[PDB]
């Protein structure tokens, strides 16, 4: 199947440079024009750059003179070299494939870029166990507070993915130049605390991969 896998996301300081990469799989790379499209907070999709199957190149006015799109057809890879980055450049960056007109019939998973002078900070991960009254209904809800990390994103799973039904992970809120996210999971009350429930949090920017068990308190 068609695959587009973006790399190079992360945190860069204002005025800095960064190279995004996209590895294409599952089609003849040289038959297709390729593009970058971004989605920044508060904004809808915004086309950034396009490159023809072999070379014709177009840029959004907002990035001209700063960004360079290129491709290496021998390696099925698309690049976006970024320079003089600004805060406004912070966004999810999608690599996309066209057909024969500039209609993008396939979009990658997206890479998150944050431009900021704040430093990379690992999250503090706190287990949220319910109080006494909130146990032993038919269901029980547990939580995970992921606090004070930078930059986005963080990934949260419960029991390594086993529990995914009954999970709600909430969008991060940026406060104090730091992000805070929460996640809940709702399981039968016969399940917890008899069995262990763990939230697993990954913050690739800081090489954080934490497993936090939800333990009930002591009386």
């Amino acid at each position: 199947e068609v695959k587009l896998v973006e790399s190079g996301g992360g945190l860069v300081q204002p005025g800095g440079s960064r190279k995004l990469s996209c590895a294409a799989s599952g089609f003849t790379f040289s038959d297709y024009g390729m593009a970058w499209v971004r989605q920044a907070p508060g904004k809808g999709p915004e086309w950034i750059a396009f490159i023809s199957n072999l070379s014709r190149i177009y840029y959004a006015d907002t990035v001209t003179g700063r960004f360079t799109i290129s491709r290496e057809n021998d390696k099925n890879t698309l690049f976006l070299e970024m320079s003089s980055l600004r805060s406004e450049d912070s966004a999810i960056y999608y690599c996309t494939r066209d057909d024969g007109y500039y209609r993008v019939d396939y979009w990658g998973q997206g890479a998150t870029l944050t431009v900021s002078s704040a430093k990379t900070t690992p999250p503090s991960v706190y287990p949220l166990a319910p109080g006494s009254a909130a146990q032993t209904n038919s269901m029980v809800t547990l939580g995970c507070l992921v606090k004070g990390y930078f930059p986005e994103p963080v990934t949260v799973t419960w029991n390594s993915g086993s529990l995914s039904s009954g999970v709600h992970t909430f969008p991060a809120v940026l406060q104090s130049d730091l992000y805070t996210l929460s996640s809940s999971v709702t399981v039968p009350s016969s399940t917890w605390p008899s069995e262990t429930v763990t939230c697993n949090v990954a913050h690739p920017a800081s090489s954080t991969k934490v497993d936090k068990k939800i333990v009930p308190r002591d009386c």
Binding site: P45, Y101, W107, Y126, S132, A134, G143, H168
Partner: protein, 215 residues
């Protein structure tokens, strides 16, 4: 530049209704040279319609694209819960390629009361001197909800941070988390903490609380 406009941020519909999602271009883009994309929650966009009216592979004909020039419509006849998504138009008549800001399709469902849960700060957080009290309000409908925090009966407003999920494609509900962050210094001096929610389904506010002289 060609400006693409979608007048509706949100369109809400029950299963079975006809929804019309509209798009305007500021200049004549002809034929087509207009595309529709569909973006479901937790997914990247997918091509839905191109050349104004041609369905992409895999798209059922309850989706109909129409229009030419400057006025375009994506109609979803007999809409299904499967169609929960944001829909964006794009012109490809000239550079720069431009998008509308998207229309979100909300699936109407029967009213649903939130399941509200309140959590004291973790001992681990308290050790570092912070005290976040968390309230989850899960699986409700419709989307509008108001949360108030109280400490020993008195309303607290500063230090409250809220976050909302998008509509869930599995039960058409919303969820919300509300976090009251205090210093441990202040948290220590009070006993009762209360999360209070008002919703379409509530008469008296939904009240969830804990006292600290406890487990």
């Amino acid at each position: 530049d060609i400006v693409m406009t979608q007048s509706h941020k949100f369109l809400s519909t029950s299963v079975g209704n006809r929804v019309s999602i509209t798009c305007k271009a500021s200049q004549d883009v002809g034929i087509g040279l207009v595309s529709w994309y569909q973006q479901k929650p937790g997914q990247s966009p997918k091509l839905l319609i191109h050349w104004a009216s041609t369905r992409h592979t895999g798209v059922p004909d309850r989706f109909t694209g129409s229009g030419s020039g400057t006025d375009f419509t994506l109609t979803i006849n007999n809409v299904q819960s499967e169609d929960l998504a944001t829909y964006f138009c794009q012109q490809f008549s000239n550079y720069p390629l431009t998008f509308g800001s998207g229309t979100r399709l909300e699936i109407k469902r029967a009213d649903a009361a939130p399941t509200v849960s309140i959590f004291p700060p973790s001992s681990e957080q308290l050790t570092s001197g912070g005290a976040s009290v968390v309230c989850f309000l899960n699986n409700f409908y419709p989307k509008d909800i108001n949360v108030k925090w109280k400490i020993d009966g008195s309303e607290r407003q500063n230090g409250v941070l809220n976050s909302w999920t998008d509509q869930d494609s599995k039960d058409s509900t919303y969820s919300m988390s509300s976090t009251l962050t205090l210093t441990k210094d202040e948290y220590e001096r009070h006993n009762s903490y209360t999360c209070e929610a008002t919703h379409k389904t509530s008469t008296s506010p939904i009240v969830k609380s804990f006292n600290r002289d406890e487990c």
